[PDB]
Design a protein around this ligand. Structure first.
Ligand SMILES: NC(=O)c1ccc[n+]([C@@H]2O[C@H](COP(=O)(O)O)[C@@H](O)[C@H]2O)c1
Ligand SMILES: NC(=O)c1ccc[n+]([C@@H]2O[C@H](COP(=O)(O)O)[C@@H](O)[C@H]2O)c1
Lengths: 461, 461
């Protein structure tokens, strides 16, 4: 990894575009005004990509040769980097201030800020914008996940009276659905800020390496079948597949995909008759978890619950299946369908304790920077020894307006958050800044554990 | 990276669910029936994650410790992996056949197959499904990027009778909008299969390391301004920013974002009057590229085109701006809005040679496995010494039905593609199988250069 090659190309030519005599470039990151976002992921970026000696004679050479060919010109600021190499032993003269990871802050607030600690490197602050803006992913995943947790708590509570098992209603199935091995780990860890159910193993590695927890692992899983593990027996032997797997994993929870050929036939006949004796004998701590994987998410769940209800003993006002029988909808689930499904179940008078959800692509991939409008902007800049407040303000789009001057975040007397502009924070009217330095001159100054982060992101419930 | 930790959690328990006496598991990947996909990206995966000695005593122990806590049970198939370490020195007893990369194949066709080469490793085939499926991303970006090229080619050919400069009509801006550094490079290289304009430097590295090109680099870029490059000067001194920039880059093409305050009160006044002399004086090889970044993409472009048309000399029957002035729409661009904009310009009688497009999130992030239905499935298995064709066929979703038995791809006598199922491919009816062994027993057996891929992915016309 060469940080000199980890930025938008045009940013290579920027050092020649700022106002002469500029000794400071101050920028900030916000989820421009999901009215509530979870701040998570910076630490990962700090350690893995910005910490220590990121500049070397070799890397400078490599960049030089690349850009020379990339621009068909020699715009690369070779001298600017050698400076950092020769004076700071390849460490970035920058200071990043940010809110504690895990913090739930309303939109339109400053989350973190970046500024060069050396006037000569006034061009460095925005050079690292590209790599820093990717924190949108961890923030969005955690937030979107947390909002799904809210939807689940609301309905689980309404239909059962408690939230027993909430931490496991949304299971991560997004490993194969994301765009890369790295994205898998980042996103899966973001999801674990809110839940404990995951099949995206890469998530456990990242958390262990960059954040850490008291317990051995942040998330857990259970044995489960996949289509190949069923179809391999042959269509005529689907029942044999089911019987084998349930017996193999008899003393623990086990999920078996039942839609290989006909999910309904499977629930009514196979599970409800042919193997019924193997199911009802199951412990409450190790139930069978039937798993549909096709057709309309809400219709299939209701139709599957309706059938199992005629084959098994169904019992606050909502119908509950036997403690040894459960269902998991792990197909076509995203924040929107999730809402439709629980509301759809609530209507049909089905308790939510009867179900769990598996979300992959909709949980870790179908997310974008526009969702929370994660943006990095220049608000302050010193030119000719004079500090002026800068900002954009497109005419045809008042939403894209950025904040002005030096920023700071404060806890308001009423216990809320307020972001102050134009250095007004220096006047601690609402107390001291909430943003703390987490990085400075190649050194990670402040770090948080996954346990802290999890605590900070708890729901009000 | 630990391949023993790079799979979906439930796949760790699959070895105990397969039919007993199973010696082989044969699976395939396809983009279930965008009626034409660009196969690209496997080579990156094979070399970086599957090649060589990927199994070691350490990795076995690590994987064992994690899964013991993850499953709260000891289910990890330690004996299975030790066998691989002792028998093949950590090399994966797997063989992967695949259609040449860059190949443009219609959908519903097998793109690559996987199977174990040693009976005791029948479980390995689907253990690596998770990591192999992520190839959906490169395949999708490249395909989406190629379809957009078709659109640009169609309208640029009707408005100017020549595809000159098509290669640079769609610039990659998605570096910051993507979920990770690795995704950025993977996706960027994918886009570069069809174009040469990019700002996502990560892509140049990956191509150089895993594919290689005749030329020094796959993509190129030109100097461009950023909002902070304009606003740093101050609201009142926007014209100064513009002048300084166009001057700094007076001999090379330059892009200047001009919507920081008022896009229209910038093209008519500043660019059309105040600094017009610095513009009409520019070379055809270093024009001024005006860049709006907000408001309706189509409307802003059309309105900006009329302004510039009434301040500069305008000339197949379609309007054209002086060779020293051009426009790039680098906001709100995706496959769909791209079509609309080129369409809108056509109805307004403007030539496409007048504009270029920059796409970020829409290009590399707003995509999922759903788009092309990229799926990995088991089609052939050998149990009790006999091989049977297997597959899924969900009642409620005919679309999710999978192919049966050993597969092969063939070039029809009409220069088309066809997938022969049930090993019927052994019969040289339509020639020889196009799937080539690319990986076997831990070694990459066949590779392609980026030049071959681009060649294989070319468009008709
Ligand atoms: N434990 C499990 O049953 C499990 C885990 C991971 C992925 N998957 C499968 O892959 C899919 C997830 O990917 P998407 O949600 O992105 O389509 C699911 O629909 C499911 O069929 C299943
Ligand atoms: N050369 C360039 O002008 C350039 C390069 C990379 C990113 N960008 C910015 O980032 C945006 C693209 O990212 P998204 O389309 O994903 O929001 C553009 O609208 C632009 O404002 C601009």
């Amino acid at each position: 990894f060469n940080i000199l090659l980890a930025t938008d190309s045009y940013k290579v030519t920027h050092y020649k575009q700022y106002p002469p005599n500029t000794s400071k470039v101050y920028s900030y990151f916000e989820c421009r005004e999901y009215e509530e976002t979870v701040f998570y992921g910076l630490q990962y970026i700090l350690n893995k990509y910005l910490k220590g000696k990121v500049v070397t004679k070799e890397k400078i050479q490599e960049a030089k040769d690349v850009y020379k060919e990339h621009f068909q010109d020699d715009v690369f600021n070779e001298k600017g980097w050698n400076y950092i190499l020769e004076k700071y032993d390849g460490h970035l003269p920058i200071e990043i201030k940010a809110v504690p990871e895990g913090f739930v802050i309303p939109r339109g607030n400053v989350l973190f800020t970046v500024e060069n600690t050396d006037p000569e490197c006034y061009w460095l602050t925005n050079w690292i914008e590209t790599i820093l803006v990717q924190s949108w992913y961890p923030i969005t995943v955690a937030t979107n996940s947390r909002e799904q947790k809210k939807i689940l708590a609301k309905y689980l509570l309404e239909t059962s009276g408690n939230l027993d098992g909430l931490e496991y209603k949304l299971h991560d199935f997004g490993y194969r659905g994301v765009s890369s091995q790295e994205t898998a780990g980042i996103g899966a860890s973001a999801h674990l800020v809110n839940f404990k159910g995951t099949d995206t193993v890469a998530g456990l590695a990242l958390i262990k390496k960059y954040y850490g927890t008291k317990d051995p692992v942040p998330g857990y899983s259970v044995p489960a079948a996949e289509h190949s593990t069923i179809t391999a027996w042959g269509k005529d032997h689907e029942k044999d597949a089911f019987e084998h797997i349930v017996t193999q994993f008899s003393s623990v929870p086990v999920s078996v995909v039942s839609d290989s050929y006909d999910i309904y036939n499977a629930c009514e006949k196979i599970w409800g008759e042919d193997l019924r004796h193997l199911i009802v004998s199951r412990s409450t701590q190790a139930p069978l978890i039937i798993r549909p994987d096709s057709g309309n998410p809400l219709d299939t769940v209701l139709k599957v619950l309706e059938i199992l209800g005629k084959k098994f003993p169904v019992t606050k006002g909502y119908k509950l299946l036997p403690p040894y029988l459960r269902v998991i909808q792990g197909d076509g689930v995203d924040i929107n369908t999730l809402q439709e499904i629980v509301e759809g179940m609530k209507q049909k008078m089905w308790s939510i304790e009867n179900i769990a959800f598996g979300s992959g692509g909709g949980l870790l991939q179908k997310l974008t920077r526009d969702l929370l409008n994660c943006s990095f902007k220049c608000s302050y800049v010193v030119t000719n020894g004079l500090g002026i407040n800068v900002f954009k303000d497109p005419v045809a789009d008042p939403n894209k307006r950025s904040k002005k001057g030096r920023l700071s975040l404060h806890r308001t007397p009423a216990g809320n958050f307020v972001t102050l502009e134009e250095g007004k924070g220096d006047l601690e009217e609402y107390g001291q800044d909430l943003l703390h330095t987490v990085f400075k001159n190649g050194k990670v100054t402040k770090s948080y554990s996954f346990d802290e982060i999890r605590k900070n992101a708890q729901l009000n419930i």
